[PDB]
Design a protein around this ligand. Structure first.
Ligand SMILES: Cc1cc(O)c(-c2ccc([C@@H](C)CN(C)C)cc2)c2c1[nH]c(=O)c1sccc12
Length: 296
């Protein structure tokens, strides 16, 4: 109604995003449908997070449509030219370090808005990252986003896509907050440099092994509460010592920033606010203007 679906874009979870026109090309997504009808809770949770997350580095919501006896719910949003995963598969040469810093600064600023507003996204991935022709980066999907409070409690155990899933979720952590989001940001950082996924594990066991092979095998000394972890209680993985795959590509401060991103201990994991304060973004390859981004 009121929109002509030009072409469906992609399917995520039970939600699907189309491309329509107003008079102006728009982006339209229908939220996940629920069997129980007695207003959908999952639809409301997605609506709440995306509204509170309204930010220049977040997708612009034009309208939200409900009706049909509350069976169908739609969210009208401004159409973005590209999604980041598409560029990775359709670029001849890797992103410049200045462009990477600009995208990371855009990403980190948007992440800080969510956490300051008690918002957890938990589904940070390249295909969920939208890049405009003008260099503006926005976050697209909120199908996993959820609110959290100061007194922490148990939430959704299995969250985040396996490739970007935090190790604590890979080890079945009962409580998690803001640590998984920063882990995904670190995973996206490595992908940008190499145009390839950082940890493309085939399964949860493979995902844990891939992380441990390069980042080493964590322990109680480097991670308090490792013994109490439900997975580590009845399991013991192979000890992998030491590995940098970005030789002569990432600066010394770049490695330090990445190490803080991919920190095994959630407490020692760098926050979004401290990420922007790292000297890597203030190094010799200064970030490039968003308006100066090359052609797509
Ligand atoms: C050019 C372009 C490509 C895309 O892959 C997506 C997009 C479509 C689905 C999702 C989620 C459900 C799930 N994805 C993992 C499949 C995320 C992004 C989008 C896009 N352009 C847009 O304007 C918008 S608005 C919301 C989305 C988009």
């Amino acid at each position: 109604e009121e929109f002509q679906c030009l072409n469906r874009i992609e399917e995520g979870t039970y939600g699907v995003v189309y491309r329509a026109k107003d008079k102006e090309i728009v982006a339209l997504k229908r939220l996940k449908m629920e069997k129980e009808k007695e207003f959908p809770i999952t639809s409301l949770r997605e609506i709440n997070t995306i509204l509170k997350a309204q930010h220049p580095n977040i997708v612009t919501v034009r309208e939200i449509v409900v009706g049909s006896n509350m069976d169908k719910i739609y969210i009208v949003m401004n159409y973005v030219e590209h999604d980041l995963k598409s560029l990775m598969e359709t670029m001849k040469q890797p992103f410049l370090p200045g462009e990477v810093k600009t995208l990371m600064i855009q990403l980190l600023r948007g992440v800080k808005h969510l956490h300051d507003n008690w918002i957890l996204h938990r589904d940070l991935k390249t295909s969920n990252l939208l890049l405009s022709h003008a260099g503006i980066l926005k976050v697209g999907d909120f199908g996993l986003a959820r609110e959290y409070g100061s007194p922490l409690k148990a939430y959704t155990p299995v969250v985040v896509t396996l490739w970007y899933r935090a190790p604590e979720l890979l080890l079945g952590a009962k409580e998690y907050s803001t640590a998984v989001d920063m882990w995904s940001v670190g995973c996206i950082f490595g992908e940008l440099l190499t145009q390839k996924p950082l940890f493309p594990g085939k399964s949860e066991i493979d995902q844990i092994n891939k992380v441990f092979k390069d980042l080493g095998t964590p322990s109680e000394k480097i991670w308090p509460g490792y013994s109490e972890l439900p997975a580590v209680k009845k399991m013991t993985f192979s000890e992998h010592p030491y590995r940098k795959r970005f030789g002569a590509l990432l600066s010394d401060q770049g490695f330090d920033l990445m190490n803080k991103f991919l920190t095994y201990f959630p407490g020692r994991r760098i926050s979004a606010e401290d990420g922007l304060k790292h000297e890597y973004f203030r190094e010799t390859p200064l970030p490039i203007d968003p308006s100066m981004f090359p052609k797509l």
